[PDB]
From a paper:
Most eukaryotic messenger RNAs (mRNAs) are processed at their 3′ end by the cleavage and polyadenylation specificity factor (CPF/CPSF). CPF mediates the endonucleolytic cleavage of the pre-mRNA and addition of a polyadenosine (poly(A)) tail, which together define the 3′ end of the mature transcript. In the yeast Saccharomyces cerevisiae, CPF is assembled into a 14-subunit (∼850 kDa) complex, which is organized into three enzymatically distinct and interconnected modules: the polymerase, nuclease, and phosphatase modules (Casañal et al., 2017). The nuclease module contains the endonuclease Ysh1, the pseudo-nuclease Cft2, and the multidomain protein Mpe1 (orthologs of human CPSF73, CPSF100, and RBBP6, respectively).
Author numbering:
A (entry chain D): 28 to 411
B (entry chain A): 1 to 147, 193 to 320, 326 to 351, 358 to 380, 383 to 441, 496 to 772, 777 to 1066, 1068 to 1237, ...
C (entry chain C): 524 to 561
D (entry chain B): 1 to 39, 43 to 93
Write the structure that this text describes.
């Protein structure tokens, strides 16, 4: 029973052989034998960052009980993908072979968000009744604080040092917690309506939030007062994310169908304003290459953007990446797998493109002709 | 608390250019290895003679040329680090390079960069000498130059020049323009091999004329677009400007674009391209590198413009260009008949050496990455041709592995006498990539070849005479019993049975005299003058005992106990006279410690009657008690000269007139020619502390001597203020000069630790340890040989090995070629030494085309059999006996299998009796694509004595102990307390051993991404991760476990790991892909360490090249729990060591280093602190405990005595003493290899 | 950027004095007015 | 005194008492069983005892499938053996 395996081991062997002997990274040629020369995604930067684009569809997975997936998340080293269910269970899925059925019954209500620590030693998960559970990498209880928020937890993020983490819920209130004991620290009092997302700056102490008040606010993890606010969205801002590696950028998507990128280096300098006909649902920066991110629309239609290539249009559009609106995007921390979840109760995985494959950008994902993942082969490229 | 030193200097040539930099008399060649800029004089016959060498504190990334007004010397433009430009000028008055202007574009680049900057910026120079642009990526910094100041303010723009420019691939200045016009190659939409089927022809090209408008306060540039091209192939990466336009060298197409911006013709290379004049070629060549090295040569007088391209496999291609619109655009390959480029791969630079006033009969200097740099002669260029090797700069390629073993010291006795280098181990490293890969032995000392080992002929000191150069009368002496013997060296011996010698007094000196027609013997209190038949003729009674004798043909100089100077001259008429020679009256007043007769032309400008560089004058050189060197000629006329500055050992010396505090540091001086074929006059000074100082006489202005302090090439052998007294106390150190050792003019320094000074033609003189036994007396023997007598009365005749020995690079290098013409093992790696069997084991890594097969037997669909493929792997293990350096046994491995790690390990077979056997364990990983499950295997081998072939040294065989194929690539192998731990895909497994060769796993752990390296210190382990640093693991035995003790808080792509234990504490050394060296320690007591689970970052030290391997080696404690040090090999060919320090030693060396940085002047305006600590990890470790650079501290020894004393006064009272002590200790840290077993 | 005159000793170098970036548990304390939307 | 395989098994590390107090780890892997520990104060020498102590998790006879996959909810209270020996795999 030979399944499909996507492991970055042999590419890393090749990369370190080239690196230790001083050999250059040979340019990949459009042929099958040159896939061995496709370096791991962390090896590519600058011009050849286009090789890291998750353009290929490689696996469609769905659990036995087809619940609705409110959030997905990768393990910090990318071994397994943690899929939250409406019933409050952690469904794990191995990254190498995308197969598992490990129900865990994590929460009682619907798990709405999970977040892993930067040191890969802890996980926090919130649910629909404002309960935060702090987990261990082996998925054991470490702390179960009840009613940390009134309504459903929307988003939460760790600090750089992982001793603190901010959370947001359907309320108009953000809170800071000392991660060591879950002590209730200062409350980010402010905002007018239903904060929808929150994020922590990767290096600096800086909190970014999005609410229904048509405002993106920058907060203070120490003073606890709104240090700045962005008034450039004409409707509720669905999500905000800093650039994970450097943090020099900050995205935000609103219900006015506009995505804006702000350069925090020069007084909230706006760099992009892309307006679509379909609603943006969720966003995700690339974990390795900056200036690269993916936007998920209300009709599927995964859109990959590049700040250095185009400031008005996406550099790659997968118009039918999902049957219904895409609700969760997750990048493998290794960067070789992209995981997307939508309201069709399915989980789809995306990998980097191959030098030559017959489907290319023409498949039941790029066009509409049934759907399948061909889970019976021994390769990535499928003939015809 | 660690210090960084360069055991080996870098030897891969990365940049090269020709100009008039140091002088305008000849066309110089500038060679940049990694941080060393060397100035060479290419001879007529293609040899490279070094004239000046400089070492910079940062990695030199580019070198540029610009000419200054009213001067024939071109100013040097140095580009180091990231986005840096420094103007360098040569000051012939001081014979040193000085800095004219600095330009720091890094901060301004980051201020308008959306993403992280590229590692190295690229410098472009216009062929008009008006401006220079340094572009990193998407951002161009412009440096204009005046046609007052020499460079106006710098202005940088990203895409303000042309709106279209989005993703710049290459920028080049264009030729034949009255204004600075540049050409830009950029891809607004990025396309790779997977994007070729959606977006077609995404590369764009534009030519911009720049209106450089320098101003007093700023600089503005108004750009006018000359032309514009829209559709160009995706794989274009290089722009090669020519007279009529430019050549766009792509991975598969060459596109010619003129100065009007119209594509004329395109030449296809491989079957990997398709669709406007398209010239098709089936020659499957590929420019798969990002940058393709090439040399463009303008026409002579005539119309002959040639462009030579280069291939990663060191192929040269010829591009013809002729025009009336350009016609006949094509590509041709020039053949190599004698495959002299077979061992050379990855060329980096090409430079034309000799003008010749034509484009035929060329002289090319080409730097390479794997093989040695070659000077090539190309006689006739055609579309007969031939090539030849004129010179070579020894390159040890990328050091890919390191281990200690026995190369010398293998035999306990040689030629019936004990081995002169017994109990001595050496560092053996694998070198190069591919066909030229070999073994490089980094010798800790010079191993001398033995030709005669006669016993007990000397007691105290010998003298070998030459009646006609026939080795007669090897006179010996007995300083204890006051006896002297004659002996016959013509296979007679048993003394001469009477030859009218004294024989009853301590002979002080004896040598041939008067054109070998006389023999003069100076005993303790008497002087004699014999003949060839040894009949005594004249006797001069010395009322005072002699303590120094120097002899030239006419004169003999004798120095006595009160210091009286007596110089006698042989009478050329009938001899037997020995007339006295008059001396200046000042000589009576001054006190002299030592003296010698000398022959030099350094006074040929003050002496009356001659001002010619030739005709070196005979001089009487004397060293005073105030460390002053004085000298005078025969017809002195009471004129006494002196070398000014020797007393303070200044960086520069010159001839003057002597002008009238005894601290006799200087013990012996020597002025003689040193070198192999290009002999240069050098002034060598021996101190009573045993240290050796050297000076170089410039061929022009011969009255001046200079020393290089920036170049750390002279090894430290002693200390001034009685520190390291153990090097001179036992055996007196005397420098003996030999103009012909093996064709080399060397200097032998005797003592308990002997030294030899050897200078190669392409390098500065180097001081090498000579053997591993004490040396008492050395005399010339035969022709090109010496006789050496040790402290145990043994006598040995020595010869200098030359076959595969290089005597530069701070340590002798022996090249061991394991692959012959019969079998070529290609690149060698993971070399180990079997201690019990005294054998060396290596792994070959022959490259083969890769076939992408599925999980079943079939291959994947998209394979093309009509197309060239990518490279795979096929490895094995070789058994090599160091006695003959020959392969005894070889074992092969299946396809795609690469040995990622071999380790001769001490495996504990029995848990009860604790028995251990040194098996060999190899970690084999199957190198495949990402679309197949990882698989691998591990093998365990025994080395068992067998009956040799009816050929010696064939008595050992490789016997498999265990063998198993596992799931997941095996990337590392490590033994933990008798059990070997190997790494699978995201797992590490420990397996035990029983007597029945039964292997069973006992514990396991999960690793984040990929295991890059693994080391064990007892039952502790460190496992490096390709993305998230490394982790600390402890292993327990009875219940087997893999407790995770900590992880590095900083995620980086670690390359190699090792332990820097440093006494009671413990530290880890990690190297990243960013050329950084990270020191982390397991600190479980600090409050912020999370009880040890977080490894605290201590220091981040930026290296000048990528680290490939790291080893643990014991430290040699010269004065003072075992100590260890790390030794690492580098891609550029250098070897470095990290020597852990104590607290007091570290404080002393840190204060010395900061005082050197502040007080002293750095070469090219390079701050070592910013060359090393200015990385992405600067705000992570301790600010006041950085990694120390011994190269910076090495400059402490090069200062004047007063300045050296003042420097140590910054911290500590007697800081000079202990500072010299620990500097010596660090210098001799690797001498633990000299005392093995 | 820098013109090299012959008067000093350590000023003929590239300056290197990066200000120590104070970083607490919450992150690096930075100027909090430079984020003004302007 | 071997350069090739330097003696590293017995080295005076300053974190030995910490490595023994927690994780019950000693720099000597092959040390004799304490034979005075029951399964916390049974050891007369206490936690700082060179002889090896054994947690009750290590006396079980069946390895834990959840521990093999790294998903064992019970850290040390698990009734299955948390040790990788192929002899007693379920």
């Amino acid at each position: 029973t030979q399944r499909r395996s996507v492991d970055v081991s042999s590419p890393y062997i090749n990369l370190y052989y080239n690196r230790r002997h001083g050999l250059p990274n040979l340019v990949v040629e459009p042929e099958t034998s040159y896939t061995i020369d496709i370096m791991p995604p962390n090896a590519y930067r600058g011009r050849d960052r286009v090789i890291n684009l998750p353009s290929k569809f490689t696996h469609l997975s769905s659990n036995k009980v087809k619940h609705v997936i409110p959030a997905i998340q990768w393990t910090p080293e990318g071994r397994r993908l943690v899929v939250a269910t409406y019933s409050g269970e952690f469904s794990l899925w191995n990254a190498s072979s995308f197969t598992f059925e490990t129900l865990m019954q994590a929460h009682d209500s619907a798990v709405t968000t999970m977040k892993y620590s930067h040191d890969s030693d802890w996980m926090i998960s919130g649910d629909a009744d404002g309960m935060i559970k702090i987990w261990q990498p082996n998925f054991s209880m470490v702390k179960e604080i009840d009613a940390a928020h009134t309504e459903s937890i929307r988003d939460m993020a760790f600090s750089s040092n992982d001793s603190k983490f901010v959370t947001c819920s359907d309320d108009n209130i953000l809170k800071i917690w000392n991660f060591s004991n879950g002590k209730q620290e200062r409350v980010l009092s402010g905002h007018h309506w239903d904060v929808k997302s929150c994020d922590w700056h990767p290096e600096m102490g800086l909190i970014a939030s999005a609410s229904k008040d048509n405002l993106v606010k920058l907060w203070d993890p120490r003073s606890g007062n709104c240090i700045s606010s962005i008034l450039k969205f004409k409707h509720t801002v669905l999500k905000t994310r800093f650039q994970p590696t450097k943090g020099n950028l900050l995205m935000a998507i609103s219900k006015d169908k506009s995505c804006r990128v702000f350069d925090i280096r020069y007084s909230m300098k706006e760099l992009m304003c892309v307006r679509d006909e379909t609603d943006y649902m969720t966003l995700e920066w690339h974990p390795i290459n900056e200036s690269m991110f993916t936007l998920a629309c209300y009709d599927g239609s995964l859109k990959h953007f590049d700040l250095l290539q185009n400031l008005n249009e996406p550099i790659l559009t997968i118009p039918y990446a999902h049957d219904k609106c895409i609700t969760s995007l997750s990048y493998n921390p290794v960067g070789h797998i992209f995981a997307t979840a939508a309201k069709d109760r399915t989980i789809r995985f995306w990998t980097r493109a191959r030098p030559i494959d017959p489907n290319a950008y023409d498949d039941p994902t790029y066009n509409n002709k049934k759907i399948n993942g061909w889970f019976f082969g021994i390769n990535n490229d499928i003939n015809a | 608390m660690n210090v960084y030193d360069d055991v080996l200097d870098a030897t891969v040539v990365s940049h090269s250019l020709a100009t008039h930099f140091t002088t305008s008399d000849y066309e110089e060649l500038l060679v940049v290895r990694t941080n060393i800029l060397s100035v060479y004089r290419p001879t007529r016959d293609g040899k490279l003679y070094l004239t000046d060498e400089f070492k910079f504190h940062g990695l030199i990334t580019d070198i540029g040329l610009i000419p200054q007004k009213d001067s024939p010397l071109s100013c040097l433009l140095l580009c180091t680090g990231v986005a840096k430009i420094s103007i360098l000028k040569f000051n012939t008055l001081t014979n040193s390079i000085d800095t004219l202007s600095l330009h720091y574009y890094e901060g301004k680049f980051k201020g308008k960069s959306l993403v992280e900057l590229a590692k190295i910026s690229t410098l472009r120079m216009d062929p008009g000498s008006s401006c220079a642009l340094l572009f990193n990526n998407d951002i161009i910094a412009f440096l204009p130059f005046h046609v007052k100041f020499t460079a106006p303010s710098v202005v940088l723009v990203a895409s303000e020049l042309y709106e279209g420019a989005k993703n710049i691939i290459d920028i080049q200045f264009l030729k034949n323009f009255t204004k600075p016009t540049i050409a830009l190659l950029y891809q607004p939409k990025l396309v790779w091999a997977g994007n070729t089927t959606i977006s077609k022809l995404p590369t764009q090209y534009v030519i911009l004329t720049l209106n450089i408008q320098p101003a007093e306060s700023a600089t503005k540039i108004e750009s006018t677009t000359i032309a514009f091209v829209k559709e160009l192939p995706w794989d274009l990466h290089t722009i090669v400007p020519v007279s009529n336009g430019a050549i766009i060298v792509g991975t598969n197409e060459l596109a010619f674009l003129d100065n009007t911006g119209v594509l004329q013709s395109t030449v296809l290379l491989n079957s990997f391209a398709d669709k406007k004049i398209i010239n098709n070629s089936s020659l499957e060549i590929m420019f798969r590198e990002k940058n393709t090295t090439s040399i463009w040569i303008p026409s002579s007088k005539n119309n002959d413009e040639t462009l030579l391209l280069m291939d990663l496999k060191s192929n040269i291609y010829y591009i013809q260009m002729e025009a009336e619109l350009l016609i006949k655009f094509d590509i041709f390959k020039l053949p190599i008949v004698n495959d002299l480029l077979k061992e050379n791969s990855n060329p980096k630079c090409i430079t034309r050496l000799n003008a010749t006033n034509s484009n035929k009969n060329m002289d090319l200097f080409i730097g390479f990455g794997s093989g040695n740099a070659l000077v090539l002669r190309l006689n006739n260029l055609k579309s007969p041709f031939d090539i030849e090797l004129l010179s070579s700069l020894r390159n040890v390629g990328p050091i890919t592995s390191l281990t200690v073993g026995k190369v010398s010291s293998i035999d306990d006795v040689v030629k019936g006498l004990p081995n002169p280098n017994k109990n001595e181990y050496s560092l053996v490293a694998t070198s190069g990539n591919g066909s030229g890969s070999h073994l490089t032995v980094i010798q800790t000392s010079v191993q001398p070849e033995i030709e005669l080992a006669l016993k007990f002929i000397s007691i105290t000191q010998i003298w070998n005479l030459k009646i006609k150069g026939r080795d007669r009368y090897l006179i010996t002496t007995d300083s204890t019993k006051s006896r002297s013997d004659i002996y016959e060296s013509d296979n007679n011996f048993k003394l001469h049975k009477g030859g009218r010698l004294r024989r009853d007094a301590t002979t002080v000196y004896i040598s041939m005299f008067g054109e070998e027609k006389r023999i003069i013997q100076v005993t303790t209190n008497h002087l004699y003058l014999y003949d060839t038949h040894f009949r005594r003729l004249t006797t001069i009674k010395f009322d005072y005992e002699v303590i120094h004798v120097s002899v030239m043909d006419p004169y003999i100089l004798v120095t006595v106990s009160r210091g009286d100077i007596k110089i006698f001259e042989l009478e050329e008429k009938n001899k037997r006279k020995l007339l006295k020679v008059d001396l200046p009256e000042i000589l009576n007043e001054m006190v002299i410690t030592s003296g010698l007769i000398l022959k030099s032309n350094m006074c040929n400008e003050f002496l009356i009657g001659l001002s010619k560089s030739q005709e070196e004058q005979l001089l009487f050189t004397f060293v005073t008690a105030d460390n002053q060197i004085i000298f005078f000629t025969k017809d002195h006329n009471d004129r006494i000269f002196q070398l000014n500055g020797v007393d303070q050992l200044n960086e520069s010396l010159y001839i003057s007139t002597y002008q009238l505090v005894p601290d006799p540091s200087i013990k012996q001086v020597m002025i003689n020619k040193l070198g192999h074929d290009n002999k240069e006059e050098y002034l060598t000074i021996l101190t009573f502390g045993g240290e050796i100082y050297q000076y170089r006489k410039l061929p022009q202005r011969r009255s001046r001597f200079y020393r290089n302090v920036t170049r750390n090439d002279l090894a430290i052998t002693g200390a001034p203020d009685n520190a390291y007294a153990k090097g001179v106390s036992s055996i007196e150190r005397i420098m003996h000069y030999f103009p012909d050792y093996n064709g080399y003019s060397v200097i032998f320094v005797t003592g308990s630790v002997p030294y030899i000074l050897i200078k190669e033609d392409d390098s500065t003189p180097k001081i090498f340890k000579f053997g591993n036994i004490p040396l008492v007396s050395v005399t010339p023997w035969s022709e090109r040989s010496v006789m050496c007598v040790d402290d145990i009365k043994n006598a040995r005749v020595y010869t200098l090995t030359t076959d595969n020995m290089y005597y530069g690079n701070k340590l002798p290098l022996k090249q061991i070629k394991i692959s012959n013409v019969l079998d070529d093992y290609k690149t060698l790696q993971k070399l180990v030494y079997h201690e019990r069997a005294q054998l060396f084991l290596v792994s070959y890594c022959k490259r083969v085309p890769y076939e992408a097969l599925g999980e079943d037997g079939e291959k994947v669909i998209g394979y093309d059999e009509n197309v060239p493929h990518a490279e795979g792997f096929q490895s094995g293990i070789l058994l090599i006996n160091p006695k003959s350096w020959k392969v005894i046994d070889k074992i092969d491995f299946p396809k795609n299998s690469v040995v990622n790690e071999m380790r001769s390990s001490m495996i504990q077979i029995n848990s009860k009796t604790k028995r251990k056997r040194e098996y060999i364990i190899a970690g084999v990983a199957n190198a495949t694509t990402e679309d197949t499950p990882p698989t691998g295997a591990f093998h365990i081998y025994d080395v068992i004595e067998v009956v040799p072939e009816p050929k010696p040294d064939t008595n050992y065989k490789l016997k498999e102990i265990f063998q198993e194929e596992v799931s997941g690539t095996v990337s590392t192998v490590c033994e933990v307390s008798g059990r070997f731990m190997i790494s699978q895909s995201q797992k590490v497994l420990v397996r035990d051993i029983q007597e029945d060769n039964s292997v069973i796993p006992v514990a396991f752990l999960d690793i984040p991404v990929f295991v890059t390296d693994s080391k064990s210190f007892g039952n502790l382990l460190i496992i490096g991760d390709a993305m998230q640093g490394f982790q600390f693991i402890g292993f327990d035995a009875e219940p087997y476990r893999m407790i995770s003790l900590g992880r590095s808080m900083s995620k980086f792509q670690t390359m190699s790991l090792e332990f820097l234990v440093n006494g009671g504490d413990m530290y880890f050394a990690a190297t990243d892909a960013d050329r950084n060296v990270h020191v982390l320690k397991y600190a479980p007591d600090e409050p912020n360490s999370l009880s040890g689970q977080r490894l605290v970052h201590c220091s981040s030290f930026t290296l000048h090249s990528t680290n490939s391997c790291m080893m643990l080696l014991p430290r040699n404690e010269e004065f003072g729990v075992p100590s260890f040090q790390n030794v690492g090999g580098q891609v550029d060919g250098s070897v470095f060591k990290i020597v852990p320090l104590s607290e007091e030693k570290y404080r002393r060396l840190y204060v010395i280093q900061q005082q050197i940085i502040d007080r002293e002047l750095q070469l090219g305006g390079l701050n070592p602190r910013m060359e090393r600590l200015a990385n992405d990890f600067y705000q992570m470790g301790h600010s006041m405990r950085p990694m120390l650079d011994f190269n910076v501290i090495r400059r402490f020894c090069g200062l004047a005595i007063d300045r050296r004393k003042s420097i140590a006064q910054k911290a500590g009272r007697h800081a000079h003493f202990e500072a010299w002590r620990d500097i010596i200790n660090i210098e001799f840290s690797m001498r633990s290899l000299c005392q093995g077993k | 950027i820098i013109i090299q005159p012959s008067a000093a000793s350590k000023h003929k170098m590239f300056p290197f004095n990066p200000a120590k970036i104070k970083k607490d548990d919450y992150g690096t304390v930075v100027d909090f007015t430079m984020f003004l939307p302007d | 005194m071997s350069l090739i395989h330097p003696d590293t098994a017995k080295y005076p590390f300053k974190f030995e008492p910490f490595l023994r107090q927690e994780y019950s780890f000693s720099l000597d892997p092959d040390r004799p069983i304490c034979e005075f520990y029951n399964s916390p104060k049974s050891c007369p020498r206490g936690p700082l005892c060179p002889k090896k102590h054994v947690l009750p998790i290590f006396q079980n006879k069946i390895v834990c499938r959840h521990w093999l996959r790294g998903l064992c909810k019970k850290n040390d209270q698990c009734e299955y053996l948390h040790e990788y020996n192929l002899r007693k795999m379920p």
